[PDB]
Symmetry: none
Subunit: 72 residues, 12 copies
């Protein structure tokens, strides 16, 4: 669950959105008269009309993730 990144040294990024009457829901639990609902979102969620990820890593870059579920 260890992320490391070491860097040793010895353009135009455009995003354009023109939205009319936009509706966005992320992690959502919509219900009515339900007895129960279980939601265990624990990861990584990216949601959107214009969801852009330009140059996520450029130099030395590290990403990590870890999830679990034990019920017994």
């Amino acid at each position: 669950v260890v992320a490391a990144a070491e860097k040793t040294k010895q353009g135009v990024l455009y995003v354009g959105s023109k939205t009319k009457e936009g509706v966005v829901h992320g992690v959502a639990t919509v219900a009515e008269k339900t007895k129960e609902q279980v939601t265990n979102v624990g990861g990584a969620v990216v949601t959107g009309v214009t969801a852009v990820a330009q140059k996520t890593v450029e130099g030395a870059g590290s990403i990590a993730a870890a999830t679990g579920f034990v019920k017994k």
Copy 2:
């Protein structure tokens, strides 16, 4: 659950949004007359009409995450 980043040394980023009547919900629990709802959001949630992540890491950069669930 350890993140490290060491750096040793010896452009135009544009985002444009023109939204009309926009509605955005993140982590939301909408209900009516429900007996119970369980929501255990614990990760990483990015939500939006113009969700842009430009140059998330540029130099030495580290990201980490960790979630869990034990009920027994």
Copy 3:
């Protein structure tokens, strides 16, 4: 749950939003006559019509996170 970043040494960022009648909800629990609702948001939530993260790390930068849930 340790984050470290050491740095040793020996452009234009534009975000534009023109929103009309915008509505934004973060972590929200909307209900009516519900017996119970459980919400345990404990991670990292970024929500918005213009959600922009430009140059999250530039030099030596470290991010970390940790969540848990034990009920027994």
Copy 4:
């Protein structure tokens, strides 16, 4: 739960918002005649119509987080 950052030495950031009739709710619990609601927000929540995070770290910078839940 330890964050450290040591630095040893031996542009234009623009955000523009023009909003009309904007409504923003952060961590909110809206209810009516509900018997009970439980909300345990304890992480990191960033919510807004123009939610911009430019140059979150530039030099040696460290961020950390830690949450928990034990009910038994």
Copy 5:
């Protein structure tokens, strides 16, 4: 729960907002005739129509956080 930052040595930041009839709620508990509501906000909440965080760290800078919940 320890944060340290040591630094040894041997541009224009613009935010513009033009809002009309804006409404902002932070951590809010709105109710009517409800028997009980429990809210335990203890993390870090940033909420707003123009929520901008430019150059959160520039030199040696450290941020830390810690939350907990035990009910038994």
Copy 6:
């Protein structure tokens, strides 16, 4: 719960707001005829129409936080 920052040595920041009929609520508990409400806000809450945090740390700077809840 210890924060330290030692520094040894051997631009224009603009925020502009033009708001009309603005309403801002921080940590608020609005109710009517409710039997009970429990609010235990103890973290860090930043709320506002123009919520700007420019150059949160520049030199050696440390921030720390700590919250808890035990009910037994």
Copy 7:
């Protein structure tokens, strides 16, 4: 232009409309790069979205209209 009317002696109604984004034009003269434009109206022009005329002229009525145009 002779018109006449004469009269001698000796229920549930509903009109409904639900129109979204309705653009209506009556008498229109749309042009570009002209020299002469003449618009003469001399009768009876009714424009709208719900142009309703109910139970007109119970007795005697004259809607008579005369127009002319001389061009030399």
Copy 8:
């Protein structure tokens, strides 16, 4: 232009409209780069969204109208 009317002796109604974003134009002369424009009105022009005329002229009425135009 002779008009006449004469009269000698010896229920549930509903008009409804629900219009969103309704643009209405009556007599219109839209042009660009012209020299001469003439607009003569001499009759009866009714414009609106709900232009309703109910039970007119119970007895004797004259709507008579005369127009002319001489151009030499």
Copy 9:
């Protein structure tokens, strides 16, 4: 232009409108870069959103109108 009327002797009503963002124009002369503009009105012009005329002319009424235009 002779008009006349004469009369000798010897219920539930509802008009409703719910209009949002309604732009209404009556007699309009929109132009750019002109020399001459003439606008003569001599009849009866009714403009609005809810232009309603109910039970007019119970007895004798004359709406007679005459116009002219001489151009040499």
Copy 10:
């Protein structure tokens, strides 16, 4: 221009409007870069949002109107 009226002898009503952001124009002459503009009105012009005329002319009434225009 002769008009006349004569008369010899020997219920629940509702008009409603709920208009938001309603822009209304009657007789309008919108122009740019002109030389001559003439606006002659000589009849009967009614403008508004709720232009209502109810039960007019119970007895004898004359709405007679005459206009002229001479141009040499």
Copy 11:
């Protein structure tokens, strides 16, 4: 311009309006960079938001109006 009226012998009403941000113009002459402007009014002009005329002319009434315009 002869008008006449004569008369010889021998209920629940409601008008309502709820208007928000309502801009109303009657007779308007909007222009830029002109030389000559003439505005002659000689009839009957009624402007407003709720222009209501109820039960006019119970007996004998004359609304007669005459206008002229000579240009040499």
Copy 12:
């Protein structure tokens, strides 16, 4: 310009308005960079927000109006 009226012998009402931010213009001459402006009024002009006329002319009344304009 002859007008006349003559008369010989031998209920619940409500007008309501709730207007917010209401701008009303009657006879208007808006211009820029002109030389000549003439504004002649000779009839009957009624302007306002709630322009109401109720039960006028019970007996005999004359609203007669005459105007002229000579230009050489």
